[PDB]
Design a protein around this ligand. Sequence first.
Ligand SMILES: c1ccc(CCSc2cnn[nH]2)cc1
Length: 162
Amino acid sequence: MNIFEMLRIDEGLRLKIYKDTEGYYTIGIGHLLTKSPSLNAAKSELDKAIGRNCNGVITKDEAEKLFNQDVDAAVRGILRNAKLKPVYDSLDAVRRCAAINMVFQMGETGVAGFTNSLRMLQQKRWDEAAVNLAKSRWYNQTPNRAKRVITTFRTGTWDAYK
Ligand SMILES: c1ccc(CCSc2cnn[nH]2)cc1
């Protein structure tokens, strides 16, 4: 298991524009296109991302390329973030995957709400961090995925994905 396999499980693969759990236009392996309600706006974003006129449909190769770019962007965002980088660097490799998973799903705009969770993770207080992480809109709205990510932080194993 690695971050790509983990997120492929959590996000699935769809080759035509779909809506994510929040109702936003998405494609591929969880690639957000736009928060606008306009399907045309989503189609423009798709064509820009792929570099051709797609008509809302991509190939598996294209979905996997977008996915690699999106995982890399999440990692680089962590490494550029003064609050996230020290916590990330304190983690083992399996727990780093859980961190990337969260940033892939939620970005960085809500990092400050996770200040206490981040402190508990850096302190390696795994059970306490798991309890704190579940006190979130994230957990309530996507509980099965959040439970898998939280179990990964709690145990440092891939047990939730096996
Ligand atoms: C290290 C780095 C990141 C994380 C999850 C990020 S805390 C957050 C970021 N964006 N939304 N919530 C955990 C340990």
